[PDB]
Design a protein that fits this description.
The complex is a heterodimer of chains A (about 230) and B (about 10). Chain A is mainly α and about 230 residues long. Chain A has ten helices and no strands. Chain A is globular and about 55 Å long. Chain B is elongated, with a radius of gyration of 6 Å. Classes of the chains: A mainly alpha (about 230), B mainly alpha (about 10). The structure holds the ligand C=CC[C@@H]1CC[C@]2(C)[C@@H]([C@H](C)CCCC(C)(C)O)CC[C@H]2/C1=C/C=C1C[C@@H](O)C(=CCO)[C@H](O)C1. Chain A: Belongs to the nuclear hormone receptor family. NR1 subfamily.
């Protein structure tokens, strides 16, 4: 029972994603180059990657049906708190179970100033999400639902946010019933929501370690202005 | 505090 509106929403989110996610990595050439030899020698490259990814996430967010109805303040609140989660989510598309320059591993992320306190559960997240083998329709709906979360700190019009998210969540639940055949569909929605819960935890830890990194001006120096504005300064 | 860049990107 996929309504015409729901199909519209899926069409919109797929296109919005195709316009903000380039799997060819063409733009990665414009980043400060990665350095593998190395104390924080990957920070410049990954910082640029995150800054870029935030720009792309913002472009995706604005194309979310209903999102434009929120106040700029509430749009800001949602993007500031979700940015890191949506980047972790969208990264899964490139995350491989098996250019080698732009193929990142544990030691790469470590050379950006992060520890296994984050990295381990991040890989666990990426492996578990990958196993769900989502349809791209489900992939883009999950990212949108993540962005439009009523419970983000600093949200004023929580009822509006919730109503937008509900439209999206109802669209996800219905899509899975009608389009995703079993066994692959078993509890799929509940598992997709669990991932959002996993992302809160990853968000939490990244914020802590980012605070340790960005405390030394020498490291803060290696970040970008957008990353400083969104993640904090 | 204020988010000039984030604001500008959200049009
Ligand atoms: C297992 C994760 C792989 C990779 C390495 C580490 C990243 C940057 C994670 C780190 C914890 C963030 C570190 C950022 C810092 C400011 C230093 O704290 C977040 C997303 C992760 C990653 C993201 C990868 C992307 C590539 C591609 O899928 C992509 C876009 C293609 O245009 C995404 O936007 C970002």
């Amino acid at each position: 029972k996929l309504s015409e509106e729901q199909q519209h929403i899926i069409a919109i989110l797929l296109d919005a994603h195709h316009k903000t996610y380039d799997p060819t990595y063409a733009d990665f050439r414009d980043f400060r180059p990665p350095v593998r030899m190395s104390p924080l020698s990957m920070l410049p490259h990954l910082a640029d990657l995150v800054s870029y990814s935030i720009q792309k996430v913002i472009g995706f967010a604005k194309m979310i049906p209903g999102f434009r109805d929120l106040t700029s303040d509430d749009q800001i609140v949602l993007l500031k708190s979700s940015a890191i989660e949506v980047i972790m989510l969208r990264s899964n598309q490139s995350f491989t179970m098996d250019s080698q320059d732009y193929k990142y591993d544990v030691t790469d992320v470590s050379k950006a100033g992060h520890t296994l306190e984050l990295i381990e559960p991040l890989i666990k997240f990426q492996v578990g999400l990958k196993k769900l083998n989502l349809h791209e329709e489900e992939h883009v709906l999950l990212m949108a639902i993540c962005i439009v979360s009523p419970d983000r700190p600093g949200v004023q019009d929580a009822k509006l946010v919730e109503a937008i998210q509900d439209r999206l969540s109802n669209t996800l639940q219905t899509y899975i019933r009608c389009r995703h055949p079993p066994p692959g569909s078993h509890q799929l929605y509940a598992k997709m929501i669990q991932k959002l819960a996993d992302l809160r935890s990853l968000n939490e830890e990244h914020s802590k370690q980012y605070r340790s990194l960005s405390f030394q001006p020498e490291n803060s120096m290696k970040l970008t202005p957008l990353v400083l504005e969104v993640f904090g300064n | 505090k204020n988010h000039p860049m984030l604001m500008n990107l959200l049009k």
